[PDB]
Structures are given as C-alpha cells and as structure tokens.
C-alpha cells in the first residue's frame, strides 16, 4: 500500500530539538504527549496529494551515547539536521553531523534538510542568512521552526519527504 519514510532527527542536545517531532506528531491541537505510547512517532500524512506514513526516529536525550549515532542513523532514509538559532555551537556542530550521515549511508547525496529551531525567547545568535548560506553550500533546503507555535514544523518534514521523493 502506502509508502513509509524512515526519517531521523539529529542535532545537539539541550536546546529543544525534541519539540520538532512532538509538535508534528502531537494531537496538533492539544498540548499533551506520552512518548512511551507505541507509535507516538508514526504519522499518516498527505504530501502533494500522495498519502504516506512517516516513521520518525528522534533519540533526543541520548546525545552522550555518541558511539550509537551510526546505529541510529543507519535506520534512516532522510535526515533533519537541527540546530537552535540561539546556540552557535549547535549550528557549528552541523558540519560533522552531515559528514557522519554521508559516511553511514556511504553516499555524498543523502536526502536531508537543515532546520533552525527557535526554542525560546533568548536572543538569536545565528542569523537566517548564515544558515541559508550553509544550506546552499550543502545543496539542501533550510527551514526555520518555532518550538512553541508549531510554525515551520510541517514544512520541515514535508520538505524532507520531497527531497526523498526527488532523490
């Protein structure tokens, strides 16, 4: 039947990365969540008129298990590389995440999107132009998202699915 896409979220810890998938998969309209619930990370969606199933792996909180990244990344067909727009270090981490994905997938052309995440009202330190330039240097889309208003969230995942479909 319908295609299932195995998506993997990667990025620095401690800066609200988990809000991306929570807000997507959520009862979009009731702010509540049980992640232990079987298939709290599976979602049927319609993208460009084509129904599909998203299976999202987000290991947020396990960042210190750095030798498990390959194990987790290997499951994925497409990747969301997430940094926080108020944390320059998380933005600088992106290059190595991308290199590690290319290595695990043994490909220089892995479907992926760069996501700049606004996780609080603290001052932005990564300007959108910096992140656009980085994404363009990699040849991948850039999406900014809010961890509070759900803005950009659907765009981030749907854009990634389009990258997979057009690979």
């Amino acid at each position: 039947g319908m295609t299932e896409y195995k998506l993997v979220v990667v990025g620095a810890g401690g800066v609200g990365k988990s809000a991306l998938t929570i807000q997507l998969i959520q009862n979009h309209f009731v702010d509540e969540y049980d992640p232990t619930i079987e298939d709290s990370y599976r979602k049927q969606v319609v993208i460009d008129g084509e129904t599909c199933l998203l299976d999202i792996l987000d290991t947020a909180g396990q960042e210190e298990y750095s030798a498990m990244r390959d194990q987790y990344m290997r499951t994925g067909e497409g990747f969301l590389c997430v940094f926080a727009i108020n944390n320059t270090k998380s933005f600088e981490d992106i290059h190595q995440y991308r290199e590690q994905i290319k290595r695990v997938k043994d490909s220089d052309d892995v479907p992926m999107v760069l996501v700049g995440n606004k996780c609080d009202l603290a001052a932005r330190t990564v300007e959108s132009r910096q992140a656009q330039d980085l994404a363009r240097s990699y040849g991948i889309p850039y999406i900014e998202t809010s961890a509070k208003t759900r803005q950009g969230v659907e765009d981030a995942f749907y854009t990634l699915v389009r990258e997979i479909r057009q690979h």
Binding site: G13, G14, G16, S18, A19, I22, Q26, D31, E32, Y33, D34, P35, T36, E38, Y41, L57, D58, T59, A60, G61, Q62, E63, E64, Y65, S66, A67, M68, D70, Q71, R74, Q96, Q100, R103, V104, D106
Partner: protein, 469 residues
C-alpha cells in the same frame, strides 16, 4: 455524617474540592491537576494512604515547589486545630460531669492522627530516599530536625524518635544470596598478570561477567535527581548528573574499544578471531540479561568502521551471524523486542538507559507545567506522574544484585580502559574509519595482506562455563 473540619480560614487544607483547585482523572482517585495546597492535602489524606503518590511527589515536586516551601506547607498541614466542645459536652460540664467528647475523639482518631502520621511518612520518605535536598541546603536540614524534634504527644512519639535517628544516620553516611557465585574463569592471561590482559587473552566469559558487574554498578548508582528536570541535557549536567554521565561514558568507551580492537587488527584471519570473540562476549551478555552490554556490541558492529568489513563478515560462522542479528533485532522498530524482553526476563538485568532518557525528556518537553481552568493555574500533576513512572521503572531494576564474584584486576582493567587516549572524538573516529579503509579498501582497490600481530593462540575457549570440584 462526615466529620466536620476546621474553618478554611484557620486551616487552609479544609477548603472544599472544586474544579478551581483540583481535577481528577477519569479505588482511590488519581489527580490530573491541582493547586499545591490540594496536592499536599491528598499527599497526606485522612481517608487513605498513597505510597506511590508519596514517591511520585517527592521525586518531582521541585518543578513546582521549592524544598523550603514544601517543608513550610507540610508543617502547616501537620498543625491541625482541634474542635471545641459540643452542646452535649457543654451540658455535661455544666452539671459537673465528664463530657463524652465523642466528636473530639473521633476527629483525633480519624482525621488528626492519620493526617499527622502521613505527614511524618512524607518526612520519612523525604529523608530516606530524597536526602539530596538536605545535603544541598543545610538550613533545610536544620528546619527538618527542629520540626521532628519538637513534635509532642504520645501518638506520634515512636515515629518522631525513629525519624530523628534516621536523620542523624543519613548525615554521617551488604548482600545475601541463595547460591555461591560461579568460579572466576581464566584463559591466556593468568591471575595477577594485568600487563597481558586484552580482548583475546582474558576469558570471554569473565570479560562479560566483569563488564556486567561494572555496568550493573554504574546503572544502580543513577538517582532520580540526575533525571528530573532533564538536567543531564543542560549546561550544568556534569554537576547534576555525574553518575548518569559516568555510566554513558563507560558504554561509549567500550563500544569504541570494540571498534578499535577490530580495525587495528590488520590481518584478516586475526580480525575474524577478534570479531568472533566479541560476538561470544555478546552471547554471554544476553545470558546475563546485560542489555547495556548487548547494545554496546551491536553499536560497535553497526558502526561505520566495522559495518563495511565485508571480507571479515564473510568468514564469521553462521551461528554467530544469527546471534548478532537477533541482538540487533532487539533495537528494531523503536526497541519493540527489547522492551518486551526486558519486561519478561527474571532479574538481575542491566537495562539500556537511553530509552528512559528520551522518554523522560519528551514527557517533560511535550506537556505543559500548568493547566488553566476557570481562571486558575493548576499544577499539571499527570505530567509529573508520567515522569515518576519512568524513574520508578528504573529503580525497580536497580534493586537486584548479580551473584557474580568481582575480580579486582579485571575490574580495574575495564575501569581504566581509554581507547581514545589523548585524542579528541572526531580525530579518533576519523582514525578508526581510515583504519577500516586501510585494512579493507573500497572496491575496486585490491585487498592487501597484513602480517599477524598476536603471538598467542587465537582459538577461543568458548562461552560455556567450567566447574572443577
């Protein structure tokens, strides 16, 4: 009828329940949300005890109430006013007789004494199982000592005197088994010859046993204080989550050590023996229910430097490929088979902690701190209950000790294992991948030959234990 209560003006915990101050989930009630006053009332309720609630509350309350304020509130809860004499008592006294004081006696027996005792039970659990509040705030401890040490009256006396001693013990602060542990197993390296200890020279059974004791100890040392508030992800994580981080760093180091042992063995035949030995260790981990150990191995075998060694893979026996496959299948579909296996085995076990970390973090991030109802902000207690369900599961697997004997030298060897040396992580993992490319180059480059590096026999002694008299 029900007992009458003090006026809510002199005793705040007698206000009637309403949706402006408490909300229940759909045979004791389960609280969805409430004011802190109502949470503390139900924490110390006169009609029933709720020891699970006590654990949940004491584990999670700091996200909505400071320790100093909690103590003030439970002291307030404790100080219950007694009712005045009733009309019948008054008439008895006016006639020079002793009043029956029936209503007073009932209120003491059925309200004051249960509530006071349950306040003391909160104090007792707080001191016994959440003593870090008092380690980190000496004045809080002074206040608790003074409160407990000045409770008067005979009904509470046994527990007051007990709690005083418990506190004093905690300030200045042994396993029995149904069996003898099995005999420590030795291979090429003999007892006391730590300079020869290595992956292939220690007995694979004993590598797995000693790593399991080490990983069990690391697992058992993690307290809920290192988890609530997602503090292991925040800037002060080294201060607030040191035992958790030590545990994870051990796991990371062992995975990297496995990868290093593999890719630094340049001779194909020798490298096959290394991988086979690692899968034998995995087999013993499975037998011991050391799921942390299982995943340390799986992570190494699925890593970029190891995964691509097709020439090494081709020579691994079928039975060992199957063992590794079954271990990897535990992690598939968001750990579906792992979760079911963990819930079916007979402890002791060593769980994989990463799943708990993600579930705690997502529970805290994905649920609001308060619910707004009728213009009031109520503490969202269901969110805290969900977190405490996870910390409770963690604690349940921390109780059971392994019936295995420590070997101090092998223990020290794995405690001091440092595969990265002085190298940073990126430089070291690039090194491992370049080593992989060297020993098995990308097609169409030809496969080179390399000299042997081990002077001792490569044959495994196997993983079934031996038993002399």
């Amino acid at each position: 009828g029900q007992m009458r209560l003090p006026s809510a003006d002199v005793y705040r915990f007698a206000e009637p329940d309403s949706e402006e101050n408490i909300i229940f989930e759909e045979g004791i009630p389960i609280i969805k949300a409430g004011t802190v006053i109502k949470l503390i009332e139900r924490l110390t309720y006169h009609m029933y005890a709720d020891p699970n609630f006590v654990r949940t509350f004491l584990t999670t309350y700091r996200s909505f109430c400071k320790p100093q304020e909690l103590l003030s509130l439970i002291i307030e809860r404790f100080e219950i006013p007694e009712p005045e004499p009733t009309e019948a008592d008054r008439i008895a006294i006016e006639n020079g007789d002793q009043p029956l004081s029936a209503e007073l006696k009932r209120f003491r027996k059925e309200y004051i004494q249960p509530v006071q005792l349950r306040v003391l039970n909160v104090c007792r659990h707080w001191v016994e199982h959440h003593f870090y509040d008092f380690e980190r705030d000496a004045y809080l401890l002074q206040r608790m000592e003074e409160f407990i040490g000045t409770v008067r009256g005979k009904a509470m006396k046994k527990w007051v005197e007990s709690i005083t001693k418990i506190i004093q013990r905690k300030k200045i602060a042994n396993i029995t088994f149904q069996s003898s542990p099995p005999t420590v197993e030795w291979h090429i390296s003999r007892p006391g010859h730590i300079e020869t200890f290595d992956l292939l020279t220690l007995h694979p059974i004993e590598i797995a046993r000693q790593l399991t004791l080490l990983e069990s100890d690391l697992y058992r040392a993690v307290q809920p204080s290192e988890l609530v508030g997602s503090v292991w992800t925040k800037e002060d994580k080294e201060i607030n989550s040191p035992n958790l981080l030590k545990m994870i760093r051990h796991t990371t180091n062992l995975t990297l050590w496995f990868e290093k042992c593999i890719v630094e063995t340049e001779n194909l035949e020798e490298r096959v023996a290394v991988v086979s030995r690692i899968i034998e260790i995995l087999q013993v981990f499975q037998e011991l229910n050391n799921f942390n150990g299982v995943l340390e191995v799986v992570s190494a075998m699925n890593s970029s430097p190891v995964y691509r060694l097709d020439h090494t893979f081709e020579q691994i026996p079928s039975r060992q490929k199957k063992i590794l496959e079954e271990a990897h299948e535990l992690s598939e579909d968001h750990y579906k088979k792992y979760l079911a296996k963990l819930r079916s085995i007979n402890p002791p076990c060593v769980p994989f902690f990463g799943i708990y970390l993600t579930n705690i973090l997502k529970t805290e991030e994905g649920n609001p701190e308060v619910l707004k109802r009728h213009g009031k902000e109520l503490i969202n207690f269901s969110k805290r209950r969900k977190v405490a369900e996870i910390t409770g599961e963690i604690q349940q697997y921390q109780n059971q000790p392994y019936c295995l004997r420590v070997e101090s030298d092998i223990k020290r060897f794995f405690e001091n294992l440092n595969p990265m040396g002085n190298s940073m992580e990126k430089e070291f993992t690039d090194y491992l991948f370049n080593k992989s490319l060297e020993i098995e180059p990308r097609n169409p480059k030809p496969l080179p030959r390399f000299p042997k590096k081990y002077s001792y026999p490569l044959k495994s002694p196997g993983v079934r234990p031996s038993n002399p008299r």
